[PDB]
Amino acid sequence: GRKEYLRKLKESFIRRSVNTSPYARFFILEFQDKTDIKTVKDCIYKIQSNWSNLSKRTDRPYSPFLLFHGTSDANLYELKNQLFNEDLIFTDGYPFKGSVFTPKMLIEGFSNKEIHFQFINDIDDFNETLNSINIRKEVYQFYTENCLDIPSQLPQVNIQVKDFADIKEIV
Amino acid sequence: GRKEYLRKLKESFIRRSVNTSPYARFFILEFQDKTDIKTVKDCIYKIQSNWSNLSKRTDRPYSPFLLFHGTSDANLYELKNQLFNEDLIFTDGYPFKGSVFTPKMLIEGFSNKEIHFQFINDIDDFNETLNSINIRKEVYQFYTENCLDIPSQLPQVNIQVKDFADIKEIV
Amino acid sequence: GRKEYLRKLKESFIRRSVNTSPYARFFILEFQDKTDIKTVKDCIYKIQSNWSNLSKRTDRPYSPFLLFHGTSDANLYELKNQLFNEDLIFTDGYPFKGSVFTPKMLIEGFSNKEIHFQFINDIDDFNETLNSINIRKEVYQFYTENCLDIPSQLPQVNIQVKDFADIKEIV
Amino acid sequence: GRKEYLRKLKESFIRRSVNTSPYARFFILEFQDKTDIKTVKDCIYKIQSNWSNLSKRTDRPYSPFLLFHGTSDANLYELKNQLFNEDLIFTDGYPFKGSVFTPKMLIEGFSNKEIHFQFINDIDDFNETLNSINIRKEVYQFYTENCLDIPSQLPQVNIQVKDFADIKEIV
Amino acid sequence: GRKEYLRKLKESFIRRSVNTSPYARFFILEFQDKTDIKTVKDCIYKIQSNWSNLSKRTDRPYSPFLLFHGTSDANLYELKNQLFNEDLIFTDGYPFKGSVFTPKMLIEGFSNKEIHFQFINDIDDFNETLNSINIRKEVYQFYTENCLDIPSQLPQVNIQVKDFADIKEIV
Amino acid sequence: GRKEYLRKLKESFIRRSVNTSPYARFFILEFQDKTDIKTVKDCIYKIQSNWSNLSKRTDRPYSPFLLFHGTSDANLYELKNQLFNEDLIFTDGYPFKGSVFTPKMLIEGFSNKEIHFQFINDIDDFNETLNSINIRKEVYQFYTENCLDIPSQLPQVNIQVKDFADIKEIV
């Protein structure tokens, strides 16, 4: 059936235990120009609610890493602005204007409970962040037509959705 | 079967998690002078009970925003007066008589455990409050004849119901 | 099958949640002379055990309101004398002999953990206490041959049973 | 199936809730001098484990009442002696040798955490017991060929079993 | 199939509740010459892990009683020495060398959290212990050719297995 | 179907309880030359997450023992050097450079909450640490083409896998 397509992809590679261990979860989402602003935030909030545990009870907080490609910087910063306005505080390695890429902010924001997720701007920020993370890194890709190139010593999943709307129910 | 339409509207649009995050939830209901006040109150109490967590244990309380359209102000205030008489304390942006619409009264009332929900009198109060809540806002519409226009940067669902009685089992 | 009508009667009108809010629940039962005194108490204890939360953990206690019609006053008091003997303490608005109807005793017994339910003698005490409880009141009717006239501004359900024996498995 | 006769007697007559209220529960088992003591002790321990709540958490303890009939006192006392030897402390209204029947021991033993159940020697002790507990009393009769007479003012169930061995998995 | 034979003797004879009461459970196993000691230790550890509850929270600890027959004393002590080497602390009524059987040592070890189970050397130690435990005792027999003689007043089950390795899934 | 062989391999040998006791669990894995370094780490992390309970709540911590073979030391140390980089702290009985095998470091790391698992370099270190752990030891083998010889006094399972990828969903 139609609903069966979403039912296979949910636990084939994306399956989730009752308490997932705090590893460096990288979520690569393809942002094409046809996909509007609104449904990306519905995916990001679903990514943030599941694969981040920032409750005060635990001592091992973790947050997902978010990567977008195939988009212009105009709507990438436009999406970035509303996420911060809606109190979904993130870090992208640029703590101030005119900063060089500082992955040490991504180090502490992963363990910070007040920072919900982590944004990655481009390819060069993603590869430099990978060397900065020393703990286990798993990278999940949700693409439609274009696939990113990922270094081969990392556990990767590749999921080809119909469009961006099908990503959210998987995650 | 006859319930088969109800399930398609329950779990596919207004699916509910047991630990839903404190979003600015907007509920738009069509009051159109043919449904009685009592059936609206049962829908309002059901909207209150499911989509507000005002327990003393939590640190992130939330309350749903309710807006009615298509009816006169006479039965809108009559519905409004019965809700306050039954100890369902709400706020509507008019803390006193002859007041200008005060959006911040709807703001601490979102985080107030003693304020059960928020009442929106008209579209003009709905649209200007939309610029007041900074956090993510979700709008849920339940309508029988006329669907209200919502600006396109919000996550909206539009559900067409047979009458006002079918809303409360959906929520 | 034969148990099917019990499923058309249990979760379609008298569906029960585990965290039901403290509402003024009215239970109107048709007690006829054919019905034995003993089998009514099995319904009263089932109604009291399900629709009352008098535990010391909560701060919002509630008790059901019970109405009986279609019976003589002699056997109604005979039932009333039994329930007080078995430590099922109730109030009827008559705290002493020769008293007028005091609905205030029914208000305090609703919020009292040591008072298990509330008795209503006839129609006139039902309508007088109807204007006394300010919070939302729901009326549930279980009857075989005579239907009461409940005012239309209250949420009412009407259920037909063959006799009084099937009411307790409904609730 | 062969099991289906046990299923129609499990959930239709002796259905059990996890939070059963402290009622004066009377269990009548028929002793017919051909069942050995061991299966009777297996039935009593199943009755005691399920229908008594003597934990330190609760503030409303309750213990079942045990009645046997149709047998001589030779095996009735001999069964009674083993149950006290296995630290299953009970009361029977005879706290000392040559005592008259004292039902007050069974009322205190009903609410005592250190008294597991209550023994009833005969139908004359049972009727005198019946007028002593004021709270609601239900009688469960499990028998093979002889049925005792219970007053019609009490909620009673009657279960006919193939032999004494089917009683323990009903309770 | 073949696994239906495991189901017919698992849930029908050695069915287990999560809150089993502290009874003096006896497990009688046929140790033949064909059985290796390694398989027996898997069965003994499974007997401990299910039918002993020695947590620090409970106030009623219990431990099973272990009996073996049909084997020589050479491999009985060799099995006995391996169990003590793997920190499975037990007692057998012989607290020192050259001791007479001491049934009281099997008594506190029933209630001792640091004593995991009780070993019984032969027939004469089993019957002598049977007169020492006052509380209810249940005896479970698993054997392949020879069935041990058991006193009739003791509640017992008799289970016929293909070999010793099938015992551990049943218990 | 295809996942049938996975179900025939999962709960029939490597069945897991939620309260598994602290056993000296040995995991022997076939690291042949065709296996990538990365896909072994997914099995090591799955073995560590399931068969180790290093939480601060318990007082009996346990860690799995890992053995690898079928390849040279070039990729065995390269796999070993990565696991220490990702904060998966282990011990192998070689606490310093040029050390003799110290099985005592494996015993303390078994009970150490900050040591996640234990590495075994070869069979010579496996047999030496075999005589060091006094408690019950279980050995689990997962292999494709070579099966090693384990002494027959230990509980062993042998599982043939198509390649190293299916081992992780088995455990």
mmCIF file with all atom_site columns, C-alpha atoms in Angstrom, chain C residues 29-157:
data_model
loop_
_atom_site.group_PDB
_atom_site.id
_atom_site.type_symbol
_atom_site.label_atom_id
_atom_site.label_alt_id
_atom_site.label_comp_id
_atom_site.label_asym_id
_atom_site.label_entity_id
_atom_site.label_seq_id
_atom_site.pdbx_PDB_ins_code
_atom_site.Cartn_x
_atom_site.Cartn_y
_atom_site.Cartn_z
_atom_site.occupancy
_atom_site.B_iso_or_equiv
_atom_site.pdbx_formal_charge
_atom_site.auth_seq_id
_atom_site.auth_comp_id
_atom_site.auth_asym_id
_atom_site.auth_atom_id
_atom_site.pdbx_PDB_model_num
ATOM 1   C CA . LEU C 1 29  ? -30.897 5.485  37.388 1.00 0.00 ? 29  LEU C CA 1
ATOM 2   C CA . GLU C 1 30  ? -34.394 4.046  36.973 1.00 0.00 ? 30  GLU C CA 1
ATOM 3   C CA . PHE C 1 31  ? -35.085 2.091  40.167 1.00 0.00 ? 31  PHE C CA 1
ATOM 4   C CA . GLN C 1 32  ? -38.373 0.224  39.791 1.00 0.00 ? 32  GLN C CA 1
ATOM 5   C CA . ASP C 1 33  ? -40.170 -2.051 42.235 1.00 0.00 ? 33  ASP C CA 1
ATOM 6   C CA . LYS C 1 34  ? -39.260 -5.065 40.081 1.00 0.00 ? 34  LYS C CA 1
ATOM 7   C CA . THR C 1 35  ? -35.575 -4.321 40.702 1.00 0.00 ? 35  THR C CA 1
ATOM 8   C CA . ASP C 1 36  ? -34.178 -5.893 43.861 1.00 0.00 ? 36  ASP C CA 1
ATOM 9   C CA . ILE C 1 37  ? -32.567 -3.662 46.490 1.00 0.00 ? 37  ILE C CA 1
ATOM 10  C CA . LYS C 1 38  ? -29.338 -5.706 46.421 1.00 0.00 ? 38  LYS C CA 1
ATOM 11  C CA . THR C 1 39  ? -28.580 -5.469 42.689 1.00 0.00 ? 39  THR C CA 1
ATOM 12  C CA . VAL C 1 40  ? -28.824 -1.661 42.708 1.00 0.00 ? 40  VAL C CA 1
ATOM 13  C CA . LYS C 1 41  ? -26.004 -1.448 45.276 1.00 0.00 ? 41  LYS C CA 1
ATOM 14  C CA . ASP C 1 42  ? -23.744 -3.379 42.894 1.00 0.00 ? 42  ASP C CA 1
ATOM 15  C CA . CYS C 1 43  ? -24.311 -0.545 40.417 1.00 0.00 ? 43  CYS C CA 1
ATOM 16  C CA . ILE C 1 44  ? -23.795 2.124  43.097 1.00 0.00 ? 44  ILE C CA 1
ATOM 17  C CA . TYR C 1 45  ? -20.473 0.622  44.188 1.00 0.00 ? 45  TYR C CA 1
ATOM 18  C CA . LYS C 1 46  ? -19.407 0.276  40.542 1.00 0.00 ? 46  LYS C CA 1
ATOM 19  C CA . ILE C 1 47  ? -20.324 3.916  39.866 1.00 0.00 ? 47  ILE C CA 1
ATOM 20  C CA . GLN C 1 48  ? -18.528 5.074  43.028 1.00 0.00 ? 48  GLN C CA 1
ATOM 21  C CA . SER C 1 49  ? -15.379 3.029  42.355 1.00 0.00 ? 49  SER C CA 1
ATOM 22  C CA . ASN C 1 50  ? -14.992 4.239  38.757 1.00 0.00 ? 50  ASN C CA 1
ATOM 23  C CA . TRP C 1 51  ? -16.222 7.857  38.671 1.00 0.00 ? 51  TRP C CA 1
ATOM 24  C CA . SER C 1 52  ? -14.752 9.071  41.967 1.00 0.00 ? 52  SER C CA 1
ATOM 25  C CA . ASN C 1 53  ? -11.119 9.790  42.857 1.00 0.00 ? 53  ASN C CA 1
ATOM 26  C CA . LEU C 1 54  ? -10.983 10.375 46.617 1.00 0.00 ? 54  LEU C CA 1
ATOM 27  C CA . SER C 1 55  ? -7.323  9.408  47.030 1.00 0.00 ? 55  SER C CA 1
ATOM 28  C CA . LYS C 1 56  ? -5.133  11.556 49.268 1.00 0.00 ? 56  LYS C CA 1
ATOM 29  C CA . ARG C 1 57  ? -2.570  12.065 46.479 1.00 0.00 ? 57  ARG C CA 1
ATOM 30  C CA . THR C 1 58  ? -4.721  14.428 44.399 1.00 0.00 ? 58  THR C CA 1
ATOM 31  C CA . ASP C 1 59  ? -5.813  17.992 45.136 1.00 0.00 ? 59  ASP C CA 1
ATOM 32  C CA . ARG C 1 60  ? -8.972  17.832 42.961 1.00 0.00 ? 60  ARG C CA 1
ATOM 33  C CA . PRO C 1 61  ? -11.356 15.217 44.384 1.00 0.00 ? 61  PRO C CA 1
ATOM 34  C CA . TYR C 1 62  ? -14.699 14.481 42.776 1.00 0.00 ? 62  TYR C CA 1
ATOM 35  C CA . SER C 1 63  ? -17.727 12.328 43.555 1.00 0.00 ? 63  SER C CA 1
ATOM 36  C CA . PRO C 1 64  ? -20.684 11.240 41.410 1.00 0.00 ? 64  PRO C CA 1
ATOM 37  C CA . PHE C 1 65  ? -24.232 12.483 41.884 1.00 0.00 ? 65  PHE C CA 1
ATOM 38  C CA . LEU C 1 66  ? -26.874 9.750  42.070 1.00 0.00 ? 66  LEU C CA 1
ATOM 39  C CA . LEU C 1 67  ? -30.569 10.095 41.203 1.00 0.00 ? 67  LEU C CA 1
ATOM 40  C CA . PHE C 1 68  ? -33.273 7.442  41.560 1.00 0.00 ? 68  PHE C CA 1
ATOM 41  C CA . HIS C 1 69  ? -36.811 7.658  40.186 1.00 0.00 ? 69  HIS C CA 1
ATOM 42  C CA . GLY C 1 70  ? -39.833 5.453  39.648 1.00 0.00 ? 70  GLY C CA 1
ATOM 43  C CA . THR C 1 71  ? -39.762 3.961  43.149 1.00 0.00 ? 71  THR C CA 1
ATOM 44  C CA . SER C 1 72  ? -41.629 4.323  46.410 1.00 0.00 ? 72  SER C CA 1
ATOM 45  C CA . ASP C 1 73  ? -40.085 6.444  49.146 1.00 0.00 ? 73  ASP C CA 1
ATOM 46  C CA . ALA C 1 74  ? -40.148 3.507  51.586 1.00 0.00 ? 74  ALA C CA 1
ATOM 47  C CA . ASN C 1 75  ? -37.794 1.262  49.611 1.00 0.00 ? 75  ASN C CA 1
ATOM 48  C CA . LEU C 1 76  ? -35.724 4.264  48.491 1.00 0.00 ? 76  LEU C CA 1
ATOM 49  C CA . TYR C 1 77  ? -34.944 5.003  52.145 1.00 0.00 ? 77  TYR C CA 1
ATOM 50  C CA . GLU C 1 78  ? -34.441 1.269  52.744 1.00 0.00 ? 78  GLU C CA 1
ATOM 51  C CA . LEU C 1 79  ? -31.718 1.295  50.089 1.00 0.00 ? 79  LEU C CA 1
ATOM 52  C CA . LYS C 1 80  ? -30.476 4.597  51.527 1.00 0.00 ? 80  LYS C CA 1
ATOM 53  C CA . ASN C 1 81  ? -30.218 3.071  54.998 1.00 0.00 ? 81  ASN C CA 1
ATOM 54  C CA . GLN C 1 82  ? -28.172 0.135  53.683 1.00 0.00 ? 82  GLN C CA 1
ATOM 55  C CA . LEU C 1 83  ? -25.501 2.197  51.893 1.00 0.00 ? 83  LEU C CA 1
ATOM 56  C CA . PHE C 1 84  ? -24.799 4.208  55.044 1.00 0.00 ? 84  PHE C CA 1
ATOM 57  C CA . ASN C 1 85  ? -24.470 0.981  57.055 1.00 0.00 ? 85  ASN C CA 1
ATOM 58  C CA . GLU C 1 86  ? -21.695 -0.323 54.768 1.00 0.00 ? 86  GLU C CA 1
ATOM 59  C CA . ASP C 1 87  ? -19.514 2.799  55.298 1.00 0.00 ? 87  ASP C CA 1
ATOM 60  C CA . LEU C 1 88  ? -20.380 4.293  51.890 1.00 0.00 ? 88  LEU C CA 1
ATOM 61  C CA . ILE C 1 89  ? -20.923 7.756  53.341 1.00 0.00 ? 89  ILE C CA 1
ATOM 62  C CA . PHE C 1 90  ? -23.083 10.043 51.196 1.00 0.00 ? 90  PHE C CA 1
ATOM 63  C CA . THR C 1 91  ? -25.028 13.300 51.442 1.00 0.00 ? 91  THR C CA 1
ATOM 64  C CA . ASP C 1 92  ? -28.455 14.239 50.092 1.00 0.00 ? 92  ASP C CA 1
ATOM 65  C CA . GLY C 1 93  ? -28.737 17.893 51.110 1.00 0.00 ? 93  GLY C CA 1
ATOM 66  C CA . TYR C 1 94  ? -30.611 16.899 54.294 1.00 0.00 ? 94  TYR C CA 1
ATOM 67  C CA . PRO C 1 95  ? -27.996 16.958 57.075 1.00 0.00 ? 95  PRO C CA 1
ATOM 68  C CA . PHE C 1 96  ? -30.597 16.622 59.856 1.00 0.00 ? 96  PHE C CA 1
ATOM 69  C CA . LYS C 1 97  ? -34.192 15.578 60.445 1.00 0.00 ? 97  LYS C CA 1
ATOM 70  C CA . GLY C 1 98  ? -36.822 17.994 59.189 1.00 0.00 ? 98  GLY C CA 1
ATOM 71  C CA . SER C 1 99  ? -34.267 19.937 57.151 1.00 0.00 ? 99  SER C CA 1
ATOM 72  C CA . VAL C 1 100 ? -34.888 21.936 53.996 1.00 0.00 ? 100 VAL C CA 1
ATOM 73  C CA . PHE C 1 101 ? -32.821 21.033 50.938 1.00 0.00 ? 101 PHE C CA 1
ATOM 74  C CA . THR C 1 102 ? -29.271 22.323 51.445 1.00 0.00 ? 102 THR C CA 1
ATOM 75  C CA . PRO C 1 103 ? -27.360 22.033 48.142 1.00 0.00 ? 103 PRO C CA 1
ATOM 76  C CA . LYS C 1 104 ? -24.273 23.445 49.898 1.00 0.00 ? 104 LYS C CA 1
ATOM 77  C CA . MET C 1 105 ? -23.870 20.052 51.594 1.00 0.00 ? 105 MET C CA 1
ATOM 78  C CA . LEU C 1 106 ? -23.799 18.519 48.112 1.00 0.00 ? 106 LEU C CA 1
ATOM 79  C CA . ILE C 1 107 ? -21.126 21.026 47.027 1.00 0.00 ? 107 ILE C CA 1
ATOM 80  C CA . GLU C 1 108 ? -18.780 20.231 49.921 1.00 0.00 ? 108 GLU C CA 1
ATOM 81  C CA . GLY C 1 109 ? -19.400 16.495 49.628 1.00 0.00 ? 109 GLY C CA 1
ATOM 82  C CA . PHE C 1 110 ? -18.320 16.684 45.985 1.00 0.00 ? 110 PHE C CA 1
ATOM 83  C CA . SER C 1 111 ? -14.878 17.909 47.089 1.00 0.00 ? 111 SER C CA 1
ATOM 84  C CA . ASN C 1 112 ? -14.741 15.799 50.277 1.00 0.00 ? 112 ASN C CA 1
ATOM 85  C CA . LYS C 1 113 ? -12.640 12.639 50.180 1.00 0.00 ? 113 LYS C CA 1
ATOM 86  C CA . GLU C 1 114 ? -14.579 11.145 53.108 1.00 0.00 ? 114 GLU C CA 1
ATOM 87  C CA . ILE C 1 115 ? -17.910 11.505 51.260 1.00 0.00 ? 115 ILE C CA 1
ATOM 88  C CA . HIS C 1 116 ? -18.026 8.911  48.506 1.00 0.00 ? 116 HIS C CA 1
ATOM 89  C CA . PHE C 1 117 ? -21.025 10.017 46.423 1.00 0.00 ? 117 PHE C CA 1
ATOM 90  C CA . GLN C 1 118 ? -24.064 12.301 46.538 1.00 0.00 ? 118 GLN C CA 1
ATOM 91  C CA . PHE C 1 119 ? -27.712 11.251 46.708 1.00 0.00 ? 119 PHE C CA 1
ATOM 92  C CA . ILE C 1 120 ? -30.579 13.130 45.064 1.00 0.00 ? 120 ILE C CA 1
ATOM 93  C CA . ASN C 1 121 ? -34.051 12.294 46.345 1.00 0.00 ? 121 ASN C CA 1
ATOM 94  C CA . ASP C 1 122 ? -36.378 13.461 43.567 1.00 0.00 ? 122 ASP C CA 1
ATOM 95  C CA . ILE C 1 123 ? -36.791 15.901 40.675 1.00 0.00 ? 123 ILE C CA 1
ATOM 96  C CA . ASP C 1 124 ? -37.008 19.080 42.772 1.00 0.00 ? 124 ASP C CA 1
ATOM 97  C CA . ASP C 1 125 ? -33.710 18.495 44.584 1.00 0.00 ? 125 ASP C CA 1
ATOM 98  C CA . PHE C 1 126 ? -32.099 17.701 41.220 1.00 0.00 ? 126 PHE C CA 1
ATOM 99  C CA . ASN C 1 127 ? -33.179 21.011 39.678 1.00 0.00 ? 127 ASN C CA 1
ATOM 100 C CA . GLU C 1 128 ? -32.285 22.985 42.813 1.00 0.00 ? 128 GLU C CA 1
ATOM 101 C CA . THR C 1 129 ? -28.751 21.581 42.950 1.00 0.00 ? 129 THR C CA 1
ATOM 102 C CA . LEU C 1 130 ? -28.512 22.100 39.171 1.00 0.00 ? 130 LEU C CA 1
ATOM 103 C CA . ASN C 1 131 ? -28.144 25.843 39.816 1.00 0.00 ? 131 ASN C CA 1
ATOM 104 C CA . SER C 1 132 ? -25.701 25.214 42.693 1.00 0.00 ? 132 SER C CA 1
ATOM 105 C CA . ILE C 1 133 ? -22.683 23.486 41.118 1.00 0.00 ? 133 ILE C CA 1
ATOM 106 C CA . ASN C 1 134 ? -20.986 26.160 39.022 1.00 0.00 ? 134 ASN C CA 1
ATOM 107 C CA . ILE C 1 135 ? -18.488 23.871 37.235 1.00 0.00 ? 135 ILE C CA 1
ATOM 108 C CA . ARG C 1 136 ? -19.356 21.712 34.215 1.00 0.00 ? 136 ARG C CA 1
ATOM 109 C CA . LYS C 1 137 ? -22.014 19.080 34.932 1.00 0.00 ? 137 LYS C CA 1
ATOM 110 C CA . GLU C 1 138 ? -22.588 15.923 32.890 1.00 0.00 ? 138 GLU C CA 1
ATOM 111 C CA . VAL C 1 139 ? -25.744 13.835 33.281 1.00 0.00 ? 139 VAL C CA 1
ATOM 112 C CA . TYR C 1 140 ? -25.764 10.140 32.365 1.00 0.00 ? 140 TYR C CA 1
ATOM 113 C CA . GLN C 1 141 ? -29.121 8.362  32.246 1.00 0.00 ? 141 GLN C CA 1
ATOM 114 C CA . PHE C 1 142 ? -29.635 4.605  32.526 1.00 0.00 ? 142 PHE C CA 1
ATOM 115 C CA . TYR C 1 143 ? -33.284 3.592  32.265 1.00 0.00 ? 143 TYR C CA 1
ATOM 116 C CA . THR C 1 144 ? -35.622 0.908  30.946 1.00 0.00 ? 144 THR C CA 1
ATOM 117 C CA . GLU C 1 145 ? -39.082 2.419  30.470 1.00 0.00 ? 145 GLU C CA 1
ATOM 118 C CA . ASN C 1 146 ? -39.351 6.078  31.650 1.00 0.00 ? 146 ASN C CA 1
ATOM 119 C CA . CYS C 1 147 ? -37.130 8.895  30.386 1.00 0.00 ? 147 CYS C CA 1
ATOM 120 C CA . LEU C 1 148 ? -36.614 12.052 32.438 1.00 0.00 ? 148 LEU C CA 1
ATOM 121 C CA . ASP C 1 149 ? -36.729 15.580 31.046 1.00 0.00 ? 149 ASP C CA 1
ATOM 122 C CA . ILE C 1 150 ? -33.270 17.017 31.710 1.00 0.00 ? 150 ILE C CA 1
ATOM 123 C CA . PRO C 1 151 ? -32.741 20.685 30.726 1.00 0.00 ? 151 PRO C CA 1
ATOM 124 C CA . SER C 1 152 ? -31.059 20.936 27.337 1.00 0.00 ? 152 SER C CA 1
ATOM 125 C CA . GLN C 1 153 ? -28.054 23.086 28.310 1.00 0.00 ? 153 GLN C CA 1
ATOM 126 C CA . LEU C 1 154 ? -26.322 20.098 29.960 1.00 0.00 ? 154 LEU C CA 1
ATOM 127 C CA . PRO C 1 155 ? -24.423 17.268 28.235 1.00 0.00 ? 155 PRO C CA 1
ATOM 128 C CA . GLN C 1 156 ? -26.805 14.307 28.518 1.00 0.00 ? 156 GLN C CA 1
ATOM 129 C CA . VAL C 1 157 ? -26.584 10.690 27.399 1.00 0.00 ? 157 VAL C CA 1
#
